[PDB]
Symmetry: D2
Subunit: 268 residues, 4 copies
Amino acid sequence: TGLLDGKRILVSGIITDSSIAFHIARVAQEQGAQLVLTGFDRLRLIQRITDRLPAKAPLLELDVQNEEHLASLAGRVTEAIGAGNKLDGVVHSIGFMPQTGMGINPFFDAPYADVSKGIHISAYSYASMAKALLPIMNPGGSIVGMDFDPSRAMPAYNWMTVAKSALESVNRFVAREAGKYGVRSNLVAAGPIRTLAMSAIVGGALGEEAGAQIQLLEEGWDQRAPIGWNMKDATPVAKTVCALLSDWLPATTGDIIYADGGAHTQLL
Amino acid sequence: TGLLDGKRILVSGIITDSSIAFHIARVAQEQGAQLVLTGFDRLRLIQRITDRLPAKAPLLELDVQNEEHLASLAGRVTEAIGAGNKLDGVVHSIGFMPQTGMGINPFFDAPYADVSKGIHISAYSYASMAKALLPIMNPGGSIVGMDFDPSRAMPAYNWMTVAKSALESVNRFVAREAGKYGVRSNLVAAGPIRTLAMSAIVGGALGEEAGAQIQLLEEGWDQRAPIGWNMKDATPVAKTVCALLSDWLPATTGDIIYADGGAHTQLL
Amino acid sequence: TGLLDGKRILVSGIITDSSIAFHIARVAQEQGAQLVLTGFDRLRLIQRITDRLPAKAPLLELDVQNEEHLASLAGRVTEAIGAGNKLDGVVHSIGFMPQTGMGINPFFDAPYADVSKGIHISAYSYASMAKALLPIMNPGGSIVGMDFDPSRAMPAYNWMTVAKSALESVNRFVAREAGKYGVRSNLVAAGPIRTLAMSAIVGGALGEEAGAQIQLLEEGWDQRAPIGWNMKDATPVAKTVCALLSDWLPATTGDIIYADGGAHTQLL
Amino acid sequence: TGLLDGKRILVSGIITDSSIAFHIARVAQEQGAQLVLTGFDRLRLIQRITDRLPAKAPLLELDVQNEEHLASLAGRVTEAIGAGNKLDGVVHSIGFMPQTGMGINPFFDAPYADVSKGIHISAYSYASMAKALLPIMNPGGSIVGMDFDPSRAMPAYNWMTVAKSALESVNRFVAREAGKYGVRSNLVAAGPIRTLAMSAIVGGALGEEAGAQIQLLEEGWDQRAPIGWNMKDATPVAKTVCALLSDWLPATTGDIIYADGGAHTQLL
Ligand SMILES: NC(=O)c1ccc[n+]([C@@H]2O[C@H](COP(=O)([O-])OP(=O)(O)OC[C@H]3O[C@@H](n4cnc5c(N)ncnc54)[C@H](O)[C@@H]3O)[C@@H](O)[C@H]2O)c1
Ligand SMILES: NC(=O)c1ccc[n+]([C@@H]2O[C@H](COP(=O)([O-])OP(=O)(O)OC[C@H]3O[C@@H](n4cnc5c(N)ncnc54)[C@H](O)[C@@H]3O)[C@@H](O)[C@H]2O)c1
Ligand SMILES: NC(=O)c1ccc[n+]([C@@H]2O[C@H](COP(=O)([O-])OP(=O)(O)OC[C@H]3O[C@@H](n4cnc5c(N)ncnc54)[C@H](O)[C@@H]3O)[C@@H](O)[C@H]2O)c1
Ligand SMILES: NC(=O)c1ccc[n+]([C@@H]2O[C@H](COP(=O)([O-])OP(=O)(O)OC[C@H]3O[C@@H](n4cnc5c(N)ncnc54)[C@H](O)[C@@H]3O)[C@@H](O)[C@H]2O)c1
Ligand SMILES: Cc1csc([C@](C)(O)c2nnc(Nc3ccn(Cc4c(F)cccc4F)n3)s2)n1
Ligand SMILES: Cc1csc([C@](C)(O)c2nnc(Nc3ccn(Cc4c(F)cccc4F)n3)s2)n1
Ligand SMILES: Cc1csc([C@](C)(O)c2nnc(Nc3ccn(Cc4c(F)cccc4F)n3)s2)n1
Ligand SMILES: Cc1csc([C@](C)(O)c2nnc(Nc3ccn(Cc4c(F)cccc4F)n3)s2)n1
Ligand code: NA
Ligand code: NA
């Protein structure tokens, strides 16, 4: 029997097979979950990518900044899962911060229009997806979002760290609302993962200094982590999301679970 | 001798004599500081209010959402303090969250345009003011912002709590930039204060439930505070800001000082 | 298939069928784990209680304050599980604070001899058990301890809260040592549970005031928990421990998982 | 006028002129405080050291593990300050952890007798001095203890980090008790300071590895600190204690003020 047997789970955030959501989606399918997938912009590309998952799943378009996509979401999910059925899980694996607010651009040089777009996609949309999906979720259900520990400041992350701090606060309010439906809301704070944006910065796309800074963060993370940290392996992160989606953490809500090799609990 | 003798300090946030900034400005002046004041919108009203302070101080217009006011700020401050002079301190006592994002309106019913405006004024502007003023600040200088503990969710505060969570993260990045100038950046987390907006909610402006919830927050705050908490007295908060503006906390930066009667350290 | 199929798990802390450890042991067994149980003092009583579990399990004597019991632990466990076999998990569900240090006695009136005994059993023993068992634990293994959120002070808990603060720090160092063996170390922060000591205080054993204070803590806990909190149900806590014992949280170490209905994330 | 003008302050923890308490005592005297000093064991040595302070002050013997020294403390202080007078400040700058629980000895190899002595001196004694001195403290008074951030584990510190975690919890309970007297209780979390024990470990007294670990911690601290960190300068730490002893932080209790150059707010 699978960890997610009989559970209907919506998974957002798939762009490539390197996406954390792809690995969440693959592990949930191996664990017997029935998926509904959401994608943004490059729908032709994600269709080809989602065809690489172990099982077939409906693919729905969802731009979190689009009010019409959100207003129709619940109805579109119902048509995909069939009338009389509700979701048991929701995975928010969405984030974006323009290069003006994250990378090499000075912290003070990020224009608010760009910071605002980043906070809309990365923090406010966790509340927006919860508003749209809670009326179609079963009691005992679970909403999971992806977090990057923003308790301490660090180089390059800049406005993304601010957006993550806003997301942590949003998660605590979403828990109050979701609790009325018997639904839990939690964040998984993952260690750094070699996704396309991460591979670009380490590889030198943002220059020598930025690459050296992220390489130092990765090296230090693995050193600090009592059990080590492998940036090239999204599996432990995907497994943690599936633990939260299961019925095995039923008294955890408005919380953060750290899937970071324990690096945040160690100074040196 | 005064705690702030010979120091040039910019104080933003004065609207009425109930404003936390008014009490900070009054305590700073009693302590021998030379002030520069900034005000938004009702300049005629704030001129009459600033005439009630113990000493005369220049009043400059500053709308934090206005890029032209920001771009000219340093130049306008220099003309008020005199050429060759720099500020030893900056007080950010600015906050705003539309009623759609704070109050009786459900957490999910706040439109992003309103949330975005609130975060711009309440969080991003701490960075925007630091960007404008750091080139005109002396080493040993101090930037102080006002916060309301957002570590745990609570009724009615809603998107303001999300804005305060974003501000705490902003302060940690401001500290990195300000450190290059030998300047400290900190937040003062005050307990609830009976300012105009607070007096309105307790008084019943937002209805029976909202008034009851805020009364319960206040009552509980005073109960958990080992030294109690007087919501009608802004002096202990003003004194704490002045301590951070002084040379008496010289190794504290990117941090939060709680002027809350110790309420946050107690469960019951 | 069970969540804990094929895993050998040591479970300490059983005294009655109300013990949190009893519910952890019962859930682990339903999930296909092979248990080794440890008990203190009343072995005849605990044998009768352990006979009430779904499956038979060896019972070993372990007084954590007894260096001879500690020195022989690994050898005695090996004889119970069979030569060539190792443990996949350890559950530390042990705690004690004399009434001078927890209850109605003023915080200042607890003698150090009593405080010291409480910290030995409640905090130091987590490290002492990890020292004794790590040489007989498999890579991928898990050590779990029971905690009660000590981040904020509260009435009556007194020196137990100080012991829990020490335990949280111990867990972070245990993680460093356990990481060398590929073993994770975590704490489960449970909400209040109606165990024998808890039922006594609520029931009036320590007088009118102490009973009223604990009733107020319980009532408030259920109020702040977005998903509520049932003090008479240890199952959600037992399930959370089993999640940490499983392979489903493999990148979490030196950490705390809150099985508290989300109460700690909410102010009111 | 001085920051501590007219204030009677008890300062414990002077052993050499490198002691953090020596610098607290020197700064408080420059700020016009009237001191009462306490010393342990080497009274002849501390007399010669205390003679190097800017002003004369009574020296009282105080071993925190000695019940008779604590029972007579208040009476002995009254005789030194004169009948009819009370203290306005108390500085706890005491700490000890045997080499078995801090340094090169493995974390698991510290015997409880040694850990217990370390917790008695470093954590329990903060409560013991508060019990003895609160009946002779004025309203508006302040108790300050020295802390080393124990939120994250680190090499060598070992059981001292555990004792500091216990101290942080003790401080929160002492605040509840002190609040009944109108007295605040806070901790100052200092960055690393080149005291005799610190100079010995960096210098190589505990071997090559331990020296390299502490040198790395110091180097990293200064790097992480937005305003830098000078381990050879206790003045910023002494100034922070004097800020807490003053009337300038009157609504802060059961709290921690970080005098660490802001290093704890930055990851890298
Ligand atoms: N090191 C890391 O990669 C790292 C670390 C911790 C947490 N996280 C978080 O995990 C999540 C997934 O990130 P990832 O690394 O897999 O990156 P990714 O690029 O693979 O996924 C991010 C996704 O956000 C989607 N998205 C962006 N704007 C959108 C919009 N307007 N509407 C809908 N979807 C939109 C993109 O299409 C993409 O699928 C993010 O929230 C990220 O911040 C990442
Ligand atoms: N209980 C409380 O009142 C409480 C508690 C903790 C922290 N705080 C924080 O303290 C600060 C001051 O609040 P207050 O209670 O004195 O309220 P206030 O209304 O007296 O002051 C808030 C100020 O923000 C200014 N402001 C708003 N929009 C602006 C803009 N675009 N440009 C520049 N200034 C603008 C207003 O003119 C006003 O002077 C805020 O950051 C608030 O969040 C308040
Ligand atoms: N509300 C609560 O009950 C609550 C809340 C959160 C966490 N916890 C923690 O959970 C754990 C289990 O508590 P419980 O509520 O099940 O109580 P319990 O009394 O049922 O179990 C505590 C156990 O500690 C054992 N113990 C005491 N001294 C010992 C010694 N010297 N050697 C070995 N074992 C010894 C006792 O025999 C008993 O089995 C403790 O660590 C407790 O602090 C309890
Ligand atoms: N890097 C550091 O040095 C560092 C960093 C942060 C915090 N602190 C803390 O600051 C405080 C002062 O430390 P320090 O560095 O000045 O060291 P220190 O050696 O100069 O002072 C420690 C003092 O504790 C006293 N003491 C020990 N046992 C005692 C007993 N039984 N009774 C009474 N007094 C006793 C000693 O006599 C000594 O005066 C300690 O609590 C320490 O942990 C130190
Ligand atoms: C927390 C995190 C790490 S990578 C990630 C997402 C969802 O892939 C991103 N969303 N928006 C991003 N924008 C930018 C702009 C520049 N980058 C590269 C970059 C990184 F990928 C990581 C750190 C710094 C950095 F500059 N990434 S990266 N989120
Ligand atoms: C942290 C805080 C408390 S009062 C405050 C400011 C600066 O006065 C505000 N800035 N924007 C505000 N917007 C609104 C909307 C509704 N209110 C009233 C209100 C309160 F004043 C306090 C709590 C809840 C609440 F609804 N306040 S109030 N900020
Ligand atoms: C954290 C916690 C809650 S109940 C618990 C244990 C393992 O049952 C205890 N271990 N030692 C205990 N000692 C005492 C002394 C007095 N009590 C009763 C009591 C409680 F059970 C709970 C809160 C306060 C209180 F006074 N409990 S209770 N530990
Ligand atoms: C927090 C801190 C740093 S130095 C300090 C005190 C009060 O001077 C100490 N109290 N007891 C101490 N015992 C030991 C045993 C060995 N040392 C040297 C040493 C250090 F001084 C610092 C880190 C590790 C280390 F091994 N120190 S050091 N407390
Ligand atoms: Na109170
Ligand atoms: Na509730």
